[PDB]
Design a binder for this molecule. Sequence first.
Ligand SMILES: CN(C)CCCC(=O)Nc1cc(C(=O)O)cc(-c2n[nH]c3cc(Nc4ccccc4Cl)ccc23)c1
Length: 331
Amino acid sequence: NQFYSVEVGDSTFTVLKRYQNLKPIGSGGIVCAAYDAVLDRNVAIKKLSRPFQNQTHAKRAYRELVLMKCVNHKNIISLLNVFTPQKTLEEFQDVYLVMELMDANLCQVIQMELDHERMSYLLYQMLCGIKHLHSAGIIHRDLKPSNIVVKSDCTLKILDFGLTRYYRAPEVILGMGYKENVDIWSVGCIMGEMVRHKILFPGRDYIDQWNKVIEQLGTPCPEFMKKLQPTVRNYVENRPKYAGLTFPKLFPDSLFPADSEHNKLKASQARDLLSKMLVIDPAKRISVDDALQHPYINVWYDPAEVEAPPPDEREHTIEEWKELIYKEVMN
Ligand SMILES: CN(C)CCCC(=O)Nc1cc(C(=O)O)cc(-c2n[nH]c3cc(Nc4ccccc4Cl)ccc23)c1
């Protein structure tokens, strides 16, 4: 047999024999660290249990499997291998996805005191990854630190393809319609969180989250309000009003290292970029291309990374999703 089974965490992993020394990593999906004896390197193995168990799980698993094949960029997940230990469609239960083993997820990195060298390079790569997605017509809308992983040399990869809701843009929260700079918002939320070491807009639901947005950034302009459908517009127009805080007060000097002129200047640059990404109205929020030209970011700008080439959506029953997924897994 090509497979063996082992108990990692609370789950059973049935994997190709090439993958050895399985060890659990992180929290959440169900993922393992392993040594791959064929490639002679360390990999991560994700177990999707019964991805066809409901139409929501199924649509996501299918969509992501299909896009992981599509895409080609060093800041986006690229699969090394995909397999099921089950031999037939009737027996089909689980899918295993294999990729590079990194060193940490971005939530761990955010907890570090980071210099501007590291923070700017992390943000640079997020923007390269996001630009690549958009170039293939993929607008993420749910970018968040827990789905981003990092190596020790600060190399980063985004692991999912989008649509914890703290990183979602106003247009997502309010059902507005969006363009590509919807994902800037989330990058802006991550950046702010790297500075504050606190989640910027930690709402338990969308009402609470909107409240924390307006409390800090201020009530948006009328121009913004009339882009909202009338009933959501009613809600938003009738919230308690807020003038909002300036970005120096949102992100005080105390948050930034002040030990050199380099760092003083980089602090002012970081706050400038933040003030252009955390903008409620997407008509006035910075784009991905403009952000890549910002002085905080442009020091890293490599056209081979920024301008790399990119290579329907119905509903189905779970029976139908199982077959669709089984097919993709088998090719
Ligand atoms: C001995 N020490 C020093 C070594 C430390 C090494 C170490 O801990 N590394 C490490 C830590 C953490 C973490 O989160 O804390 C996460 C990872 C990680 N690397 N690649 C992944 C892919 C997925 N998802 C995934 C996997 C496969 C396919 C598809 C997907 Cl989406 C999920 C998590 C990871 C690695």
